Amino acid sequence: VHFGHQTRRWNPKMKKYIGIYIIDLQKTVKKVDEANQRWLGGLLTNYKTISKRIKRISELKKEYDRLIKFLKERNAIAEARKLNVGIVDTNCDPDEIDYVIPAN
C-alpha cells in the first residue's frame, strides 16, 4: 500500500510524501493517526434537490433500480472544498486535502 504511480506522471507536490515512486510508509503511519458508484453532481451542494430524490427513493421500479445503485472524485472535493481526510496518491493533489494520507 506504498507503491505509487509511475514517475512520468507523479505530481511535484508529493515529493515529501515520495522506476516508479514508493510512498512514505513511515510518514503515513504518523498521518493515519491524525486522520462505489458514480458521484452525482451536486450531491452535497444541491441537497435541496437530491434529498427529494432521496425521499422519493424511500417512497417506479425502473427509477428505483438506478436510484438504489446511485443513492476520480474531483466532483466531490469541489462540493466540499467550496464548503470550507482521504488517501492521496502521488498523482493526486495534496494541497486540497485537510487530512492527507500519503499511502498508495
Add this chain to the structure above:
Amino acid sequence: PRKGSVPKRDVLPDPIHNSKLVTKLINKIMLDGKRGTAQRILYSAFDLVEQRSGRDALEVFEEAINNIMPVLEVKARRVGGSNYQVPVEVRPERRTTLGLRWLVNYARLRGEKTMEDRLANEILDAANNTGGAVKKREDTHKMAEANKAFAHYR
C-alpha cells in the same frame, strides 16, 4: 422511400390460364377500376391470338412478353455539369412490369378498331419480334449500349 423497401402485393392466378402474369396484364388494361371490361378484353384478345396463330394463346403470350422485356435500361444522373444516362440492369420484377406496360401502351396506339383486336395483334407482332412494343425495347437497348462506357457511374 427513405426508410427502405416496401412489401409488394401478390395476385391470384387467372381462372382460365392459371397464370399470375395474365392477372397482372388485366390490371394494366383496367381503367377506373372497371375490371370486368379489362377481363373481357384480355380473354377476347387471347381467342383472337389462338386462332390467328394456330397455337395456344398463353404460349404465344409468353413468347411475346419475352421479346418486350428489356435486359438493360438507362438511368438519369447528374455528374458535375453533364447529365449521364448510366446503363443499369433491369431487375426481374421490373422486367415484367415494363413488358406488360409497353405491350398495353403500344396496343393502345394501334389502328385496329377494338382493343381486343389491338391487343391480339400486338401480342402476335411481339411474338414475331416486331411491333411497337418490341421496337421500344430495341430503342432502350440502343440507348444503353451507347452508354456502356458510363457503366462505372452509380
Add this chain to the structure above:
Amino acid sequence: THIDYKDTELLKRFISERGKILPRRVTGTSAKYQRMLTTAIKRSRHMALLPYVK
C-alpha cells in the same frame, strides 16, 4: 567509425530495390549516422559503385 563510400556492400543495405536511400525511421539508424550514410551513397553513385535508379 566513419562510413566509406568504397564499401558498397555496407551501403547496399541502406538503399531500396529502386536504388533510393532508405529513410532512417525504416532502417533504425541514428540521425548523425544517416547523414554520413547519405554522403557516402551519393559519393558512391558518382563513382558508379552504386546505381542512381535501377
Add this chain to the structure above:
Amino acid sequence: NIENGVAHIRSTFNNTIVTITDEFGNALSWSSAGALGFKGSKKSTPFAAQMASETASKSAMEHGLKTVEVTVKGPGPGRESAIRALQSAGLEVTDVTPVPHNGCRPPKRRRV
C-alpha cells in the same frame, strides 16, 4: 513473323494509347481510344481502354507475336484494364512513368 515483343501503355486522364513492338523498339501495331471513335470523357474510361489494347494485341498477334512485355506509364485509370486484356488476347505476359529529380517548373494549378 516476330514472336518476342514489348507492349507500351500510355494511360492519361484524357486518352489511353497502346504501342506494341519488339525489344528493338521498332513498332508493329498501335491503337488508342480515339482510334475506336471514342470522344472526350468516353476516351478516358477504363472500359474504353480495354477496347483499345484488345484491338492492338489482335493486330500484333496477326504478325505472329506470342510473348510480349509490358511497360506502363501515366496515371490514367486505364491501366489494369489495358494490362489484363493483354493477357486476355492470347498473349503471354512475361512502370516507366517519368519522374524528374527536381528538374523543370510545372505549370500553374488550375483555379476551377
Add this chain to the structure above:
RNA sequence: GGCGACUUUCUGGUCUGUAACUGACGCUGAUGUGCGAAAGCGUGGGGAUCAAACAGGAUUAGAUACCCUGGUAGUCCACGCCGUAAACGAUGAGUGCUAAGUGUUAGGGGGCCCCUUAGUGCUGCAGCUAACGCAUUAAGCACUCCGCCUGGGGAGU
C-alpha cells in the same frame, strides 16, 4: 533576408569540456554605416521550362476573368541600382529569478539507464490576460538601454 546533388579551394559563426591567461575590458544604442525575399531598372550574355502583357478558343445577359491552345518581358548568369513585403513568433536587445511531464538535435559526466550543458517542439502549475491564450524558448516576477502609440476617415495623402 535566407541556405538542400556531389568535389575541391578560400572563409564566418555557434556549441561542449577545461580553468592557462587578462582582470569589468560589459549592456544598449539617437545620429551613422551596412546587409536585405520577390517584383522592377541599366549594361551585357543566355533562353530549356514556366509565364504578366498579348492573340486565338471557350463560358456568360455581358466575361477586358476564372478554363483551354499559344506566347513576349521576365524567370537564369555577371556587374551596378532599387531598399520594399502578412521582411510574422504580427512578440526589440541584455541580465537574473520562478512547479512539473514528455519528444527531438549537438555534446559532456557516471553507473541501456541516471545526472548535466546548449538548441528545438508539445503539454501543463503559480502568475499574468479583456478574452483568446502565454507559461524556464513568458505574454510571469524584476533592473538597464533603444524604437514606437495616443479615436476613425482625410492619409502614409
Add this chain to the structure above:
RNA sequence: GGAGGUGACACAUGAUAUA
C-alpha cells in the same frame, strides 16, 4: 480524441427611418 506539417456547366439583384 485533440493539435501542428503534407498532399487533394451555370446561380445577378433586392430603396429610408422605424423592428
Add this chain to the structure above:
RNA sequence: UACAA
C-alpha cells in the same frame, strides 16, 4: 406604420 418609386 410613415415614407420613397
